[PDB]
Structure 1
Amino acid sequence: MTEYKLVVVGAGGVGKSALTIQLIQNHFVDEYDPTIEDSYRKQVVIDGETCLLDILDTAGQEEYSAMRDQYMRTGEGFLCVFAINNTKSFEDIHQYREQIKRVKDSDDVPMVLVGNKCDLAARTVESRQAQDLARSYGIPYIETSAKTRQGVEDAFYTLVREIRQH
């Protein structure tokens, strides 16, 4: 049974955990909880293949860290998450994608750019801006809401599909 090793990265507070817990357990964590387990497992059927997701939910990262690079370098694909109402988090994406490229030693890494919190009205990152950023990386852009479930499955399943192309 194939296992897909996914890693969730991005700035603090963008909804990495909320996305992963919505995916795995169908619950929205509406309260920012600072001790949430990093590892998740789920058996799912994706395009007719019964498979295991092994998801590593990481933290935001402000400063370079060799142990953080090591913790995430065995991912097969990466969800690079920002929030649509957090310009900073969007601008921070390129540090995360550089870290991915450094750890995989490649510019051809399975990856999905996720614009989370799409339910919220205070949008400061336009869809076009993110589409463009994603296009510059050669990856898809998908908007999600961990609160409403919009795009959540899509983002994770898209990442599996990208891993399958690699």
Structure 2
Amino acid sequence: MAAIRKKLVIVGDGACGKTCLLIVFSKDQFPEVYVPTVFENYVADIEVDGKQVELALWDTAGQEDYDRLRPLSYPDTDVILMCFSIDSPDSLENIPEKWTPEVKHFCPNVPIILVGNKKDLRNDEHTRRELAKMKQEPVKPEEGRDMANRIGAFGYMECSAKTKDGVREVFEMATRAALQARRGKKKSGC
């Protein structure tokens, strides 16, 4: 009928594929030469269950000077994709430490989907050898499942921008979660 506008924002450590994940979702064409630091001011049309939804995709980076302006993208946020890299274990442990409190502080009572990107690289020989150099291993799916339950994640999936694997379903669940209007209020004042 009449498309409903929902705001989606992606927050994560750098080089975990957030911009690429949105880009593959937008044009379904992997950019092999040029990747902007941020993908902004785009709205995508998606239908999940009899409803047509225009999803406005915001993107947050923190390489240089974007961290100062990051907070003002949080207001009026409908759904969040907290992203990290499967081929980089360092990303996982910082989510509970730093990413979560900022998200809760600026925009609480918002759905959150914890996702791990680039499932292909966990089996890659080069990445496996590099992690083994430090007696490390790629982020196991069990750890991601435990983390999702640990921090109240709405859902946990895995993406692969190079192979375009699971992107449609991931954002499909993202908007499905967004369409839920929370549950009233808790401990509301009189």
- 1:85 deviates by 0.5
Identical counterparts, % of pairs: 34
- 1:36 deviates by 4.2
How many residues are aligned here? 164
Using structure 2 for the length normalisation, give the TM-score: 0.77
Determine the C-alpha separation between the residues in 2 that align with 1:86 and 1:31.
23
Determine the C-alpha separation between the residues in 2 that align with 1:149 and 1:24.
11
- Post-superposition Cα deviations, 1:33-57, rounded to whole Å, max 9, x if no partner, equal 3444322211222212111010002
Determine the C-alpha separation between the residues in 1 that align with 2:85 and 2:158.
9
Q: Which moved more, 1:12-21 or 1:152-161?
A: 152-161
Root mean square deviation, CA, Å: 2.2
- Post-superposition Cα deviations, 1:37-93, rounded to whole Å, max 9, x if no partner, equal 322211222212111010002114699x56311222322110011010111122222
Output the amino acid matched with 1:9: V
Q: Which moved more, 1:31-40 or 1:52-61?
A: 31-40
Output the amino acid matched with 1:156: F
Q: Match for residue 152 of structure 2?
A: 138
Q: Which has the larger radius of gyration?
A: 2
Q: Which runs of no fewer than 5 residues in structure 1 stay unpaired?
A: none
Q: Match for residue 114 of structure 1?
A: 115
Q: Match for residue 126 of structure 1?
A: 140
Alignment of 1:63-102 (within 5 A): 65=67, 67-94=69-96, 95-102=98-105
Output the amino acid matched with 1:128: E
Using structure 1 for the length normalisation, give the TM-score: 0.88
Output the amino acid matched with 1:47: D
Over 6 Å off, 4+ runs: none
